[PDB]
Amino acid sequence: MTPQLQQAIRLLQLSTLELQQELQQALESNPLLEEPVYQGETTQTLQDYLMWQVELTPFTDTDRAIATSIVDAVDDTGYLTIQIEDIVDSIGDDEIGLEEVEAVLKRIQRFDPVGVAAKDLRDCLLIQLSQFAKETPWLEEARLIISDHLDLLANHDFRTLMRVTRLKEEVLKEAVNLIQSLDPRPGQSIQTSEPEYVIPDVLVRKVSGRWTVELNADSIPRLKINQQYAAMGNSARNDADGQFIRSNLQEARWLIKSLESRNDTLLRVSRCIVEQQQAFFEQGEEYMKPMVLADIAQAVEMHESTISRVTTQKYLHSPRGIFELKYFFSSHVNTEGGGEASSTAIRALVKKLIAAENPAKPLSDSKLTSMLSEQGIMVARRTVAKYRESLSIPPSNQRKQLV
Amino acid sequence: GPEEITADIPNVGEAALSKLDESGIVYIGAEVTGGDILVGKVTPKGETQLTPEEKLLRAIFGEKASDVKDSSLRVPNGVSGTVIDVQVFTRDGVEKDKRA
Amino acid sequence: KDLLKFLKAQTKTEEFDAIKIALASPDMIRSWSFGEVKKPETINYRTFKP
Amino acid sequence: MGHIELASPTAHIWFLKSLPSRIGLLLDMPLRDIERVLYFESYVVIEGGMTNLERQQILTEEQYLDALEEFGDEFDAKMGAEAIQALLKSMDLEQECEQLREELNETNSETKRKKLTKRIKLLEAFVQSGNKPEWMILTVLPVLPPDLRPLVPLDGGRFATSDLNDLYRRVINRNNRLKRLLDLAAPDIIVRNEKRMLQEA
Amino acid sequence: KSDDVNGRTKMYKNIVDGNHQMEPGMPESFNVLLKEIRSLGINIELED
DNA sequence: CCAGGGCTGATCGTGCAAAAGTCGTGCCAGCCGTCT
DNA sequence: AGACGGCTGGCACGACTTTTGCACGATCAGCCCTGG
């Protein structure tokens, strides 16, 4: 209900990154508050490698210049970004038509990774079939279904495709295999990664099947009042100086104490939500109870907001996995079996059940609802439909193909 | 994402994957030479959103386009010889233990 | 522009004859720089960008 | 490459700390006194025109304390890194060089023949080169280009930089807190200690 | 074949083509040295 | 000189109701496999 | 080849939870003034 405190207790509802940052932000204001290997080896990857080939070949000044323009618009993931006409306009010419650029852009189609800088899928695959041996049984078939009738192929249906395009069920299917064993997205062939992405907070204790309030590693912003500057307080020269020093000291003590207060709160706060939830970890990701913040403040010795703020932006970590405290929040779901359920558990089960099914005859919604009722979960058919279509799981009736 | 060591990576022929296991791990006794896949493992790259071409492409193949970034072991260019045995350590609590 | 003089004007190095050395005036150092650094932070771990 | 503002003046370490005293040969001041002035003490005098005192004398904290009330605000003096810059910028080289040459050519002796031609040659080389002595004490600080100093990519947890930008971030945050404290009218002792720490960094 | 970035590439191009010529240019170590010297209160630049 | 009353700097409390997000869950529209 | 029935996906009512702004006068012991 306080200013000098209303924030001193909202200053923790953020991540430790920002906290450190704002702590530095206010670490300059208060004088008395304080806390080789240059061998970076380089590489290539279809930008420099693509450019590398450019030089070796015999391309004239006007052609070389153009080459870089198109070799630089090649998105790393696979194909180029902008259209072809774009490229003609970004040369800055009027005498140069598409034909001139066509060649230069056609010549590159056959470099390191055959199919690099293709644009609009079809051209890529089509080219790849050109460098193949013409003494290939499904050469003409594949090509015929590459220039046209691709939409149908893309669909789950294939019978309507063969009947119209003068194709048989036996040979044509095998032509598919030569189009299927053809690798679109050749641009990632010479691609690779080397990332990390990991944050620490409250770890695990691992004591007789239990992880807890453990300890704090590196998250406490060293806030020790300076003693060389504090000695001059009592022996201040003017009134100005004394006032200054005392104001800054009191605010420093305030901040010391608020930082220490924030630590402890979240320190032992990481042992009741996660305990009220001893099924998602031990048993697994399937086996999950519904939990609510309102119910968490009821279990623990504190207010709802108090606990909501501590838990927000606090990535937890157990040898079983690292998930943010706020992500544990789940709605409700009647079950009638000694405890309600959650929709995340619906989603994981839908997914593990679509994984273990017949590949040719797909599983479904009413079927999934019935399976759930068999195990004793009793949910709606909608919740399943929603949780299925939320995970970008394609329709299972459209996921069928030729076994 | 959790890059799972599979046995069906992209941008690689079946002949090269004929030495791998069902869980993706070079059979002990194989005469691995030169630079070949030893332990398949695909890193889950942040998938995109809509972008029509991907949707069409995804359906065409499936479980490959906009999925992962192949990056296995690959015997160091200049090493050869039969592979005596392979050891495998997994974090307790992880639902795996395929070849373990 | 022309897309031809911009690419050819990339290795315009001279003979570097008569290399000398002098003091750096406080007003001449600003000509070498374009901006001014104010924050000690270099890279943020959230999205991996400066 | 970039640069740092550094509103608070700061001297250079390659000068007045090598084998020959570059700032010492221009001001005829011993190395101990110059090093003591730059460390924010000994309260050296700047001008001392009307007051009965030399322009390049030393007046300790007690000396300045008991001399300020005697001469009033006429005796101006500084006790920071900018004191040397202010004392050096107010110097006539073309007028002093002729006087020094005449004194060295007229008053010849055993010890007078040496230790005096060196200063004359230094002043002549400084005048003929067109450089300015106040340029020795810099105001801004150009930073090393970032590409030439990688971050040493580690496993991923901690970057573990090449400890070349650590001095950089230290100086940056020190100058930032100094500029923030200057706007709040801090006591003289606190701001003096802070500027001393910035000079040392 | 040691420091010059465009030099090694042009040499490779000329050897693949079959010309066997050389263009000196300027190495990168001297530029790194100039950039490291300009970082202090010292001025240095190439003249003609 | 000591205890009673007034002034004032220190020190607290880390709470509480209000507006929006979330899924149980029902309704409703479009589409395809098959027998007529 | 189209109606019938299953399948599928989009949309919305409503109970419950998530979060988010609201800046407050109130209070207690040390210090200072004063009567017994």
PDB file of N, CA, C and O in Angstrom, chain C:
ATOM      1  N   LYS C   1      21.916   2.173 -58.540  1.00  0.00           N
ATOM      2  CA  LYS C   1      23.111   2.796 -59.100  1.00  0.00           C
ATOM      3  C   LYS C   1      23.543   2.095 -60.385  1.00  0.00           C
ATOM      4  O   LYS C   1      22.744   1.917 -61.306  1.00  0.00           O
ATOM      5  N   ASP C   2      24.812   1.696 -60.438  1.00  0.00           N
ATOM      6  CA  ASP C   2      25.366   1.018 -61.602  1.00  0.00           C
ATOM      7  C   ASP C   2      25.664  -0.453 -61.350  1.00  0.00           C
ATOM      8  O   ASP C   2      25.698  -1.237 -62.305  1.00  0.00           O
ATOM      9  N   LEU C   3      25.886  -0.839 -60.091  1.00  0.00           N
ATOM     10  CA  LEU C   3      26.202  -2.216 -59.704  1.00  0.00           C
ATOM     11  C   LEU C   3      27.494  -2.715 -60.348  1.00  0.00           C
ATOM     12  O   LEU C   3      27.768  -3.920 -60.355  1.00  0.00           O
ATOM     13  N   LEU C   4      28.299  -1.803 -60.891  1.00  0.00           N
ATOM     14  CA  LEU C   4      29.603  -2.156 -61.444  1.00  0.00           C
ATOM     15  C   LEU C   4      30.769  -1.407 -60.814  1.00  0.00           C
ATOM     16  O   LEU C   4      31.812  -2.024 -60.581  1.00  0.00           O
ATOM     17  N   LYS C   5      30.640  -0.109 -60.526  1.00  0.00           N
ATOM     18  CA  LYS C   5      31.713   0.603 -59.841  1.00  0.00           C
ATOM     19  C   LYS C   5      31.699   0.307 -58.347  1.00  0.00           C
ATOM     20  O   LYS C   5      32.727   0.441 -57.672  1.00  0.00           O
ATOM     21  N   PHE C   6      30.545  -0.097 -57.812  1.00  0.00           N
ATOM     22  CA  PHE C   6      30.456  -0.419 -56.393  1.00  0.00           C
ATOM     23  C   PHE C   6      31.196  -1.708 -56.061  1.00  0.00           C
ATOM     24  O   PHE C   6      31.721  -1.852 -54.951  1.00  0.00           O
ATOM     25  N   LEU C   7      31.252  -2.652 -57.003  1.00  0.00           N
ATOM     26  CA  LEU C   7      31.941  -3.912 -56.751  1.00  0.00           C
ATOM     27  C   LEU C   7      33.435  -3.801 -57.027  1.00  0.00           C
ATOM     28  O   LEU C   7      34.248  -4.398 -56.310  1.00  0.00           O
ATOM     29  N   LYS C   8      33.818  -3.045 -58.055  1.00  0.00           N
ATOM     30  CA  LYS C   8      35.221  -2.865 -58.401  1.00  0.00           C
ATOM     31  C   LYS C   8      35.968  -1.968 -57.426  1.00  0.00           C
ATOM     32  O   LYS C   8      37.195  -2.075 -57.328  1.00  0.00           O
ATOM     33  N   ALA C   9      35.267  -1.090 -56.706  1.00  0.00           N
ATOM     34  CA  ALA C   9      35.899  -0.208 -55.723  1.00  0.00           C
ATOM     35  C   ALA C   9      35.899  -0.894 -54.357  1.00  0.00           C
ATOM     36  O   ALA C   9      35.293  -0.442 -53.384  1.00  0.00           O
ATOM     37  N   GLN C  10      36.605  -2.025 -54.301  1.00  0.00           N
ATOM     38  CA  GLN C  10      36.701  -2.802 -53.074  1.00  0.00           C
ATOM     39  C   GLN C  10      38.136  -3.053 -52.633  1.00  0.00           C
ATOM     40  O   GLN C  10      38.353  -3.370 -51.458  1.00  0.00           O
ATOM     41  N   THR C  11      39.117  -2.914 -53.521  1.00  0.00           N
ATOM     42  CA  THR C  11      40.526  -3.104 -53.199  1.00  0.00           C
ATOM     43  C   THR C  11      41.338  -1.874 -53.585  1.00  0.00           C
ATOM     44  O   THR C  11      42.410  -1.973 -54.184  1.00  0.00           O
ATOM     45  N   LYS C  12      40.828  -0.692 -53.241  1.00  0.00           N
ATOM     46  CA  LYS C  12      41.497   0.557 -53.583  1.00  0.00           C
ATOM     47  C   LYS C  12      42.589   0.889 -52.573  1.00  0.00           C
ATOM     48  O   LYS C  12      42.525   1.922 -51.899  1.00  0.00           O
ATOM     49  N   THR C  13      43.591   0.022 -52.464  1.00  0.00           N
ATOM     50  CA  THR C  13      44.696   0.250 -51.542  1.00  0.00           C
ATOM     51  C   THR C  13      45.876   0.867 -52.282  1.00  0.00           C
ATOM     52  O   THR C  13      46.175   0.492 -53.420  1.00  0.00           O
ATOM     53  N   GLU C  14      46.542   1.825 -51.637  1.00  0.00           N
ATOM     54  CA  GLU C  14      47.691   2.492 -52.238  1.00  0.00           C
ATOM     55  C   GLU C  14      48.982   1.759 -51.901  1.00  0.00           C
ATOM     56  O   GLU C  14      48.952   0.649 -51.359  1.00  0.00           O
ATOM     57  N   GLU C  15      50.122   2.372 -52.220  1.00  0.00           N
ATOM     58  CA  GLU C  15      51.431   1.782 -51.976  1.00  0.00           C
ATOM     59  C   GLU C  15      51.879   1.932 -50.524  1.00  0.00           C
ATOM     60  O   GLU C  15      52.909   1.365 -50.141  1.00  0.00           O
ATOM     61  N   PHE C  16      51.128   2.685 -49.718  1.00  0.00           N
ATOM     62  CA  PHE C  16      51.440   2.906 -48.309  1.00  0.00           C
ATOM     63  C   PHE C  16      52.832   3.500 -48.133  1.00  0.00           C
ATOM     64  O   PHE C  16      53.516   3.215 -47.145  1.00  0.00           O
ATOM     65  N   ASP C  17      53.258   4.327 -49.085  1.00  0.00           N
ATOM     66  CA  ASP C  17      54.579   4.932 -49.016  1.00  0.00           C
ATOM     67  C   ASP C  17      54.621   6.005 -47.933  1.00  0.00           C
ATOM     68  O   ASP C  17      53.629   6.695 -47.680  1.00  0.00           O
ATOM     69  N   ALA C  18      55.784   6.132 -47.289  1.00  0.00           N
ATOM     70  CA  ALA C  18      56.031   7.157 -46.280  1.00  0.00           C
ATOM     71  C   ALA C  18      55.033   7.081 -45.132  1.00  0.00           C
ATOM     72  O   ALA C  18      54.251   8.013 -44.918  1.00  0.00           O
ATOM     73  N   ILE C  19      55.050   5.977 -44.389  1.00  0.00           N
ATOM     74  CA  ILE C  19      54.192   5.792 -43.226  1.00  0.00           C
ATOM     75  C   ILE C  19      54.769   6.580 -42.058  1.00  0.00           C
ATOM     76  O   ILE C  19      55.942   6.415 -41.697  1.00  0.00           O
ATOM     77  N   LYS C  20      53.951   7.449 -41.474  1.00  0.00           N
ATOM     78  CA  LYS C  20      54.354   8.288 -40.355  1.00  0.00           C
ATOM     79  C   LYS C  20      53.481   7.996 -39.138  1.00  0.00           C
ATOM     80  O   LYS C  20      52.656   7.077 -39.136  1.00  0.00           O
ATOM     81  N   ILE C  21      53.669   8.798 -38.092  1.00  0.00           N
ATOM     82  CA  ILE C  21      52.972   8.610 -36.825  1.00  0.00           C
ATOM     83  C   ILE C  21      53.000   9.924 -36.059  1.00  0.00           C
ATOM     84  O   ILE C  21      53.996  10.652 -36.077  1.00  0.00           O
ATOM     85  N   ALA C  22      51.892  10.233 -35.389  1.00  0.00           N
ATOM     86  CA  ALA C  22      51.779  11.460 -34.614  1.00  0.00           C
ATOM     87  C   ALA C  22      50.824  11.219 -33.455  1.00  0.00           C
ATOM     88  O   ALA C  22      50.344  10.102 -33.243  1.00  0.00           O
ATOM     89  N   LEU C  23      50.557  12.285 -32.706  1.00  0.00           N
ATOM     90  CA  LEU C  23      49.643  12.222 -31.575  1.00  0.00           C
ATOM     91  C   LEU C  23      48.196  12.320 -32.047  1.00  0.00           C
ATOM     92  O   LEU C  23      47.900  12.819 -33.135  1.00  0.00           O
ATOM     93  N   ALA C  24      47.288  11.833 -31.200  1.00  0.00           N
ATOM     94  CA  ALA C  24      45.859  11.814 -31.509  1.00  0.00           C
ATOM     95  C   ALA C  24      45.180  12.948 -30.744  1.00  0.00           C
ATOM     96  O   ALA C  24      45.038  12.920 -29.522  1.00  0.00           O
ATOM     97  N   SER C  25      44.755  13.964 -31.494  1.00  0.00           N
ATOM     98  CA  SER C  25      44.057  15.111 -30.930  1.00  0.00           C
ATOM     99  C   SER C  25      42.705  14.678 -30.374  1.00  0.00           C
ATOM    100  O   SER C  25      42.067  13.775 -30.932  1.00  0.00           O
ATOM    101  N   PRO C  26      42.239  15.285 -29.279  1.00  0.00           N
ATOM    102  CA  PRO C  26      40.928  14.902 -28.730  1.00  0.00           C
ATOM    103  C   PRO C  26      39.774  15.125 -29.691  1.00  0.00           C
ATOM    104  O   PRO C  26      38.747  14.445 -29.569  1.00  0.00           O
ATOM    105  N   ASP C  27      39.904  16.054 -30.640  1.00  0.00           N
ATOM    106  CA  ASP C  27      38.867  16.294 -31.633  1.00  0.00           C
ATOM    107  C   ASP C  27      39.025  15.457 -32.893  1.00  0.00           C
ATOM    108  O   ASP C  27      38.074  15.365 -33.675  1.00  0.00           O
ATOM    109  N   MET C  28      40.193  14.850 -33.107  1.00  0.00           N
ATOM    110  CA  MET C  28      40.403  14.023 -34.290  1.00  0.00           C
ATOM    111  C   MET C  28      39.974  12.579 -34.058  1.00  0.00           C
ATOM    112  O   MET C  28      39.620  11.881 -35.016  1.00  0.00           O
ATOM    113  N   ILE C  29      39.987  12.120 -32.803  1.00  0.00           N
ATOM    114  CA  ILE C  29      39.572  10.753 -32.506  1.00  0.00           C
ATOM    115  C   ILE C  29      38.092  10.559 -32.815  1.00  0.00           C
ATOM    116  O   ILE C  29      37.673   9.469 -33.226  1.00  0.00           O
ATOM    117  N   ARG C  30      37.279  11.603 -32.640  1.00  0.00           N
ATOM    118  CA  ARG C  30      35.855  11.500 -32.939  1.00  0.00           C
ATOM    119  C   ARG C  30      35.608  11.268 -34.426  1.00  0.00           C
ATOM    120  O   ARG C  30      34.578  10.694 -34.802  1.00  0.00           O
ATOM    121  N   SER C  31      36.533  11.707 -35.282  1.00  0.00           N
ATOM    122  CA  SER C  31      36.391  11.457 -36.712  1.00  0.00           C
ATOM    123  C   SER C  31      36.533   9.975 -37.041  1.00  0.00           C
ATOM    124  O   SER C  31      35.912   9.491 -37.994  1.00  0.00           O
ATOM    125  N   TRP C  32      37.342   9.245 -36.269  1.00  0.00           N
ATOM    126  CA  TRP C  32      37.479   7.809 -36.491  1.00  0.00           C
ATOM    127  C   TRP C  32      36.213   7.058 -36.106  1.00  0.00           C
ATOM    128  O   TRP C  32      35.863   6.061 -36.745  1.00  0.00           O
ATOM    129  N   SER C  33      35.517   7.518 -35.071  1.00  0.00           N
ATOM    130  CA  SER C  33      34.342   6.843 -34.548  1.00  0.00           C
ATOM    131  C   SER C  33      33.073   7.352 -35.224  1.00  0.00           C
ATOM    132  O   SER C  33      33.051   8.406 -35.863  1.00  0.00           O
ATOM    133  N   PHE C  34      32.003   6.572 -35.073  1.00  0.00           N
ATOM    134  CA  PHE C  34      30.694   6.934 -35.630  1.00  0.00           C
ATOM    135  C   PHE C  34      29.691   7.144 -34.499  1.00  0.00           C
ATOM    136  O   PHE C  34      28.893   8.087 -34.529  1.00  0.00           O
ATOM    137  N   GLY C  35      29.725   6.267 -33.499  1.00  0.00           N
ATOM    138  CA  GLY C  35      28.836   6.380 -32.358  1.00  0.00           C
ATOM    139  C   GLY C  35      29.572   6.392 -31.035  1.00  0.00           C
ATOM    140  O   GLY C  35      30.798   6.541 -31.001  1.00  0.00           O
ATOM    141  N   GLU C  36      28.835   6.235 -29.937  1.00  0.00           N
ATOM    142  CA  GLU C  36      29.414   6.247 -28.597  1.00  0.00           C
ATOM    143  C   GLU C  36      28.806   5.111 -27.792  1.00  0.00           C
ATOM    144  O   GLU C  36      27.582   4.951 -27.774  1.00  0.00           O
ATOM    145  N   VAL C  37      29.657   4.327 -27.128  1.00  0.00           N
ATOM    146  CA  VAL C  37      29.156   3.250 -26.281  1.00  0.00           C
ATOM    147  C   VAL C  37      28.821   3.789 -24.893  1.00  0.00           C
ATOM    148  O   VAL C  37      29.517   4.649 -24.336  1.00  0.00           O
ATOM    149  N   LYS C  38      27.725   3.281 -24.330  1.00  0.00           N
ATOM    150  CA  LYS C  38      27.253   3.769 -23.038  1.00  0.00           C
ATOM    151  C   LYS C  38      26.899   2.632 -22.087  1.00  0.00           C
ATOM    152  O   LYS C  38      26.882   2.825 -20.868  1.00  0.00           O
ATOM    153  N   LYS C  39      26.615   1.451 -22.622  1.00  0.00           N
ATOM    154  CA  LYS C  39      26.185   0.310 -21.813  1.00  0.00           C
ATOM    155  C   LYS C  39      27.253  -0.773 -21.827  1.00  0.00           C
ATOM    156  O   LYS C  39      27.809  -1.077 -22.903  1.00  0.00           O
ATOM    157  N   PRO C  40      27.575  -1.373 -20.679  1.00  0.00           N
ATOM    158  CA  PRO C  40      28.587  -2.437 -20.656  1.00  0.00           C
ATOM    159  C   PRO C  40      28.080  -3.745 -21.245  1.00  0.00           C
ATOM    160  O   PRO C  40      28.875  -4.620 -21.600  1.00  0.00           O
ATOM    161  N   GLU C  41      26.760  -3.886 -21.345  1.00  0.00           N
ATOM    162  CA  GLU C  41      26.172  -5.109 -21.873  1.00  0.00           C
ATOM    163  C   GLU C  41      26.573  -5.315 -23.330  1.00  0.00           C
ATOM    164  O   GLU C  41      26.622  -4.372 -24.126  1.00  0.00           O
ATOM    165  N   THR C  42      26.861  -6.569 -23.677  1.00  0.00           N
ATOM    166  CA  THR C  42      27.312  -6.896 -25.024  1.00  0.00           C
ATOM    167  C   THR C  42      26.286  -7.744 -25.766  1.00  0.00           C
ATOM    168  O   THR C  42      25.820  -7.361 -26.845  1.00  0.00           O
ATOM    169  N   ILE C  43      25.925  -8.894 -25.194  1.00  0.00           N
ATOM    170  CA  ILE C  43      25.009  -9.836 -25.823  1.00  0.00           C
ATOM    171  C   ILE C  43      23.982 -10.290 -24.792  1.00  0.00           C
ATOM    172  O   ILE C  43      24.321 -10.658 -23.665  1.00  0.00           O
ATOM    173  N   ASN C  44      22.715 -10.260 -25.195  1.00  0.00           N
ATOM    174  CA  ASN C  44      21.627 -10.741 -24.355  1.00  0.00           C
ATOM    175  C   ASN C  44      21.384 -12.220 -24.629  1.00  0.00           C
ATOM    176  O   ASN C  44      21.367 -12.651 -25.786  1.00  0.00           O
ATOM    177  N   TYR C  45      21.207 -12.994 -23.560  1.00  0.00           N
ATOM    178  CA  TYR C  45      21.022 -14.435 -23.656  1.00  0.00           C
ATOM    179  C   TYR C  45      19.599 -14.833 -24.031  1.00  0.00           C
ATOM    180  O   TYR C  45      19.318 -16.031 -24.144  1.00  0.00           O
ATOM    181  N   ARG C  46      18.701 -13.867 -24.224  1.00  0.00           N
ATOM    182  CA  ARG C  46      17.316 -14.195 -24.551  1.00  0.00           C
ATOM    183  C   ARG C  46      17.179 -14.605 -26.013  1.00  0.00           C
ATOM    184  O   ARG C  46      16.750 -15.723 -26.322  1.00  0.00           O
ATOM    185  N   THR C  47      17.542 -13.710 -26.930  1.00  0.00           N
ATOM    186  CA  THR C  47      17.411 -13.962 -28.357  1.00  0.00           C
ATOM    187  C   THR C  47      18.741 -13.974 -29.095  1.00  0.00           C
ATOM    188  O   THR C  47      18.740 -14.036 -30.331  1.00  0.00           O
ATOM    189  N   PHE C  48      19.868 -13.920 -28.381  1.00  0.00           N
ATOM    190  CA  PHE C  48      21.198 -13.939 -28.983  1.00  0.00           C
ATOM    191  C   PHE C  48      21.367 -12.823 -30.006  1.00  0.00           C
ATOM    192  O   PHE C  48      21.598 -13.084 -31.191  1.00  0.00           O
ATOM    193  N   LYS C  49      21.254 -11.579 -29.554  1.00  0.00           N
ATOM    194  CA  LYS C  49      21.452 -10.404 -30.386  1.00  0.00           C
ATOM    195  C   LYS C  49      22.118  -9.323 -29.550  1.00  0.00           C
ATOM    196  O   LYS C  49      21.945  -9.289 -28.326  1.00  0.00           O
ATOM    197  N   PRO C  50      22.895  -8.441 -30.176  1.00  0.00           N
ATOM    198  CA  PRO C  50      23.581  -7.395 -29.405  1.00  0.00           C
ATOM    199  C   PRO C  50      22.594  -6.403 -28.807  1.00  0.00           C
ATOM    200  O   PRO C  50      21.614  -6.012 -29.445  1.00  0.00           O
TER     201      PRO C  50
END
